[PDB]
Symmetry: C2
Subunit: 202 residues, 2 copies
């Protein structure tokens, strides 16, 4: 059983969402002035989300048992191992940042009370944490109770536009099929992800 709370200033973005429930919260619900961001101390372009409103939101939503997940391009990598680890958690809270990110003290303060994980879903830049939250939720939820790249897959018809399904796949020879699929997998891995086999990246 898992509860996931997502906190964001763009709740509309999270709409692509019995053993698990997901709730989306508008961060602005915790403001009292009639501004969630300001210029960074030390200078630089763009804006930083103030810790104040985040603190109030997380105070209400989180407990000491919560795993606080904070997407950030500067995070530890989020991988399938991470997804397995998080799949048995009772409560994930995903704090989605915007602008140039969230004041570091939010994560620091939270860590005095609960476990906090700053993670990145990949080596590219997004405009905010929301798309990352969707990826994280999908990867985690498909593992909730109740190495090499996959090779190519085929289905009917056996000939299409003059392109044949590899004849071994029609042979019914399980061992030959297993061996061919292993070869395709190791072949694809060397070409596309040599790092997975401990080789230099292109």
């Amino acid at each position: 059983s898992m509860k996931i709370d997502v906190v964001t200033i763009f709740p509309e973005y999270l709409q692509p969402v019995g053993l698990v429930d997901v709730a989306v919260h508008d961060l602005r619900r915790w403001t009292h002035d009639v501004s969630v961001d300001d210029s960074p101390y030390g200078g630089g372009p763009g804006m930083v989300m103030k810790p104040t409103v985040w603190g109030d939101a997380l105070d209400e939503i989180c407990t000491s048992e919560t795993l606080l997940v904070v997407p950030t391009p500067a995070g530890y990598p989020f991988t399938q191992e991470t997804a397995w680890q998080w799949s048995t958690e009772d409560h994930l809270v995903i704090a989605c940042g915007r602008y140039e990110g969230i004041d570091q003290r939010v994560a620091d303060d939270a860590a005095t009370r609960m476990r906090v994980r700053e993670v990145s879903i990949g080596d590219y830049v997004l405009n905010g944490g929301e798309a990352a939250a969707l990826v994280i939720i999908e990867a985690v939820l498909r593992l909730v109770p109740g190495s090499l790249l996959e090779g190519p897959s085929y289905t009917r018809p056996p000939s299409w536009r003059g392109m044949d399904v590899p004849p071994v796949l029609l042979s019914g020879d399980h061992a030959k099929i297993a061996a061919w699929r292993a070869e395709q997998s190791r072949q694809r891995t060397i070409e596309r992800r040599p790092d997975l086999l401990g080789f230099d990246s292109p």
Copy 2:
């Protein structure tokens, strides 16, 4: 000026993209994102998009005939066809930069075990095709990957949307017993830059030693 077509059996999943597009960019004709239900191209009354895998095994494979028709209609020779797949080449910021100058992206979202390989192979004989993965985790299908790709690419298109960055701070200067690092308030901007560089170095070593 970019057109993105997305093909998926879950068009409602692509709602956030439409949500994040500024009216100014659309009205300026800088971007157009269209989402297409793959079932529009099915052949049968049951609107079938999947079938059992040759060679056996669990799961299902998306049908080449349906996908072939969809891509035939939507793609041209100038299209960059993007196919998310857990077996893809890595999608990185370099990829996003390259794709940000394209006239036409088509993103083919798979489900189940993926798409019959002949779809991409056939397409590759008359347009540029890119099978890519957005990270080392497993999703249910290509839609969440498409959301990530679209955002990373479009934010590099003017006015449409190394080391790790260290921590950032803003007001108030003191909060829950934690002061902003005094160096940031020092007015010594060479020192501030050096402090930020060291923070970046330390964070990269701790979180991403692979980048070093």
